[PDB]
Structures are given as structure tokens and as C-alpha cells.
Design a protein around this nucleic acid. Structure first.
Lengths: 257, 256
DNA sequence: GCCGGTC
DNA sequence: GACCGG
DNA sequence: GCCGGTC
DNA sequence: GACCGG
């Protein structure tokens, strides 16, 4: 983590800062603590000025920096890695269509919130904003499927030392008119026990967990994580297939005439 | 529908309205352009003051005009419909601890955006906003599971004419700084083919479709719709069960 | 006191 | 809540 | 058209 | 994206 060494420097500048309320609307989804994210980001951009990127912002550089490369075919070679490509790419049309006059913008599917790159190594930083003024279910963290596929690309292409998935939790509450932050937590994904990882099928098959509570007790290799998690995925997958007939079939097969 | 009769008047008032972009940043997800839903409530509230309600506003009004009744126990009995209950009611401890000094507020998963009750008949209206500047996928309309459980209750209790589930799609486009409505569409769920509905199992098991695309040529009866939806549901389920294995298992086993 | 459904 | 297609 | 993952 | 319990 390029952010870990300065986690403190970040935790401080955040806790206690007062931002305006989210358009005075539903503090839900992509509107909860938006401001904080831009906050954490601007911070890094000032501190880690040369390592800090925003997924798309990053892509636009990768391409702009290689002006002579046109056509999705060659541009996809600008990644120099299947796995990494899988996680940051934009699709045939979008890629082929790219241009200095048709720059990439923010997309809802974008994997990471912030990209920190240095020495052929990438840190995919994703922030989770929690309305601490209550106690809710575990937030969608990332796709179990996109995770499973990512692992497979890892094993195959054998890129066990390329990227890192880290989560920065930003707890905020509504103190008066502003949206103040009260706490912050950090955690590495591949530093967690994959067999523990909870996969909520309905919840967009996303694995869910509060950064704060995320277990960081894993002492194996990244190649071992990929392999173990992938096994975890398969079992739970089958398992859900079973629970799906019980819950969504049996009790209704009685109304089916 | 109580809206239907005046939809054309609504379409006129909604089309042309503008709303300032949230933080001017990324306008997508939950809060993408949903602030339009308010404009619907606002308008609906002025033209239909006595029917227009907010799910919570309706619940609070229900409890407010029954002071003699307290405790979740008796409170849930005020609905007089196991179905409406399941669809509208709030949580037990939430119902228990209710009072003017502590009213119901906006919950993220309330079944409806607007309630227009009238004469024991309920029309649970939902507003759906779309960024017309693109060809996005159909949005989540409502859980297939919740819909299923609702279809099962209509049966068991014979409530085949108590409520309705309609949808109002409101299309917009960015006009520089604020978003501006450019169209609208109204569709009833129970008037569509209970079997052609597409169940997106990954997306909260939601039923997805662009309101403008949904049909309205169901000539059968509510009881039939229900019986047919369940059949459709119970089948898709089995499918997803199979498919899930071929897409999330088969291709990965070569790694354990 | 884990578990997971819904906008 | 509502998003396009490496 | 049809299908369906993912913030 | 992020929400609790009819």
C-alpha cells in the first residue's frame, strides 16, 4: 500500500471536517458521503501527487501517453497484463472510440475509486462511506464474480505481484447542516482470509464486509489467496444453487396449479 | 390508477422542469436524477392532495388517527390486509416505538415512492428516472421475490382488488449545469404479461424493464396474473439454479 | 447473533 | 437506485 | 431485438 | 452504491 505509510496523515485531515449536505436529498447510494471521497482524493493528489489517479483519469493518461496507438487491439496491449486489463479496461467500442476529443469519463462500473501506481505496481483503492448515525447491513464491497474471474486470470497469467485491493472506510454522520466525519478504517483485501469472505448472491453477488471488522489474519502467498478464494467461490456458488430451490421454489410450487 | 386520468397533465408539467446536478460530479447510481421523484409527489400532491402520500407519510397518518392503539401488535392489525401490510408496514421494533414525538421517516427500501390511497383502494406508484443521453440497461423495477411473496398473499387472502403497482418513468438529459426532463411514460405492472417479465437474479433478483417498453395487453384477471407470475417465477428460479452452476462452477473447478 | 434481502 | 457491453 | 453483471 | 430487522 502506497497509502498505508500516510494512513495517519489522511485519518487526521478527515476526522472532524465539515462538508455541505448531499443536495439535501436521499443520503443513499452514490450520494451518501460523496464529498469525503473527493476529499480523500484531493489529499492524496497533493501528497502522492505522482502516484494518484482515478481509474478513468488513469486510462486517459495510459492512452494519451501513447498517441501513436490506435484501434482497440493495440490499445489493449497498452496494459501489458490480462488481469490488470480485465480490471481497468473499457470495452471494444469505448476503447476504439477513445480520443483526445473523446476522453474517458467516470463510469458506474468502474472497479476502483482511486489508482496509486508506482514501479509496475498498482493499488486499487476503494472508499466506503458509512452513515454511522445507525447500524446497517454490510456494504457491497466488490463482486464475488469479478473477484473469481480476477483470481483465475491471476493463476493462468501468473501475475501474483501486480496489483492490490485495499479498502478505506469513511464513517460520517449528519451533525447539524453539514456532513461531518467521525472515524476511518483501512484494510487490505488479499490480507484477509478468503474462506471467511461473505458472498451475498442477491446483493449483486457482491462480497460484503465492514472494513473496520475485516479480518487481516492471512499468512500465505498471493498465489495461495487466489486459489483458496476461488475454491470458496465454487462451493458457495453450488450452495446458493441449492438454497435457491428451497427458498424460491418449494414454497411456491403449491400455487402452480 | 389515480394518476393515469391526469397523466397527460402531468407529462406537461414534468416535461421542461430542471433540477441542479448533485455536486456537479458523477450523476449516476441511487442518486442520479431521482430528485425528479419529488417533482412528481409535489405535482401529484397539489392536484390530488387528499390521495397523495409518501409511504412513510401514509404510515404516520395511519397511526396518528388511531391513538387508542399502541404496540406493534395492535398497530399491524390496523392495515386490515396481510398483503398491504407486507408491502407497506415497517419493522416490528419500528412499529412498536412509534409516536408523534418519533415519526416514521424515509427508509431506503420502502416498497413505494408514492401512495395515492382512496376508498380502501391502493395504487403503489414508483418513479423511475432515466438518463436519456444514453442507451443504458433496464433499471431494477422491483424484487421478483417480493413480488412472488405478494402474489402468494393475494391468493391466500383473496385480495385481488385492494392495491395496484404502477410505474412512472421520467426521462432527462443534462443541459449544462442542471438536468432537464424531456419525456415520460406510465405503465401498470398488473396489466403486463406476468410471464414476459425479466428477472435479473444478480440485481437483487429485481424485475427489470424500461417503462416505455413494457406492454399492457393482459386481458386475464388479477388472480390469474398472480397464479401465472408464480409459475413464471418458480421456473426461472430453477433455471438460475442450473445456470449458476454452469457459469460460476464448471468453468472454475479446474483450479481447486 | 449470525445471515441476507432491496432500492 | 440505475447503470451499457474487454 | 435478446441477455445480464456491477457499482 | 449503501442501506437493518413485519
Amino acid at each position: 500500500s502506497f497509502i498505508k505509510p500516510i494512513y495517519q496523515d489522511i485519518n487526521s485531515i478527515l476526522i472532524g471536517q465539515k462538508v455541505k449536505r448531499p443536495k439535501s436529498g436521499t443520503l443513499s447510494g452514490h450520494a451518501a458521503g460523496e464529498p469525503f471521497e473527493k476529499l480523500v482524493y484531493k489529499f492524496l493528489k497533493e501528497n502522492l501527487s505522482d502516484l494518484t489517479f482515478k481509474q478513468y483519469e488513469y486510462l486517459n493518461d495510459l492512452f494519451m501517453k501513447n498517441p501513436a496507438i490506435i484501434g482497440h487491439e493495440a490499445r489493449y496491449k497498452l496494459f501489458n497484463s490480462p488481469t490488470l486489463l480485465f480490471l481497468l479496461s473499457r470495452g471494444k467500442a469505448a476503447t476504439e472510440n477513445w480520443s483526445i476529443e473523446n476522453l474517458f469519463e467516470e463510469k458506474q462500473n468502474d472497479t476502483a475509486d482511486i489508482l496509486l501506481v508506482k514501479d509496475q505496481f498498482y493499488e486499487l483503492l476503494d472508499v466506503k462511506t458509512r452513515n454511522i448515525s445507525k447500524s446497517a447491513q454490510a456494504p457491497n464491497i466488490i463482486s464475488a464474480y469479478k473477484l473469481a474471474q480476477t483470481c483465475a486470470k491471476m493463476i493462468d497469467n501468473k501475475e501474483f505481484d501486480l496489483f492490490d485491493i485495499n479498502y478505506l472506510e469513511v464513517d460520517w454522520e449528519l451533525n447539524g447542516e453539514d456532513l461531518v466525519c467521525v472515524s476511518t478504517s483501512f484494510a487490505e483485501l488479499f490480507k484477509s482470509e478468503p474462506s471467511e469472505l461473505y458472498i451475498n448472491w442477491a446483493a449483486a453477488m457482491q462480497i460484503q464486509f465492514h472494513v473496520r471488522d475485516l479480518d487481516q489474519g492471512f499468512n500465505g502467498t498471493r498465489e495461495e489467496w487466489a486459489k483458496s478464494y476461488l475454491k470458496h467461490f465454487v462451493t458457495q456458488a453450488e450452495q446458493r444453487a441449492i438454497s435457491m430451490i428451497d427458498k424460491f421454489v418449494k414454497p411456491f410450487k403449491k400455487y402452480i396449479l
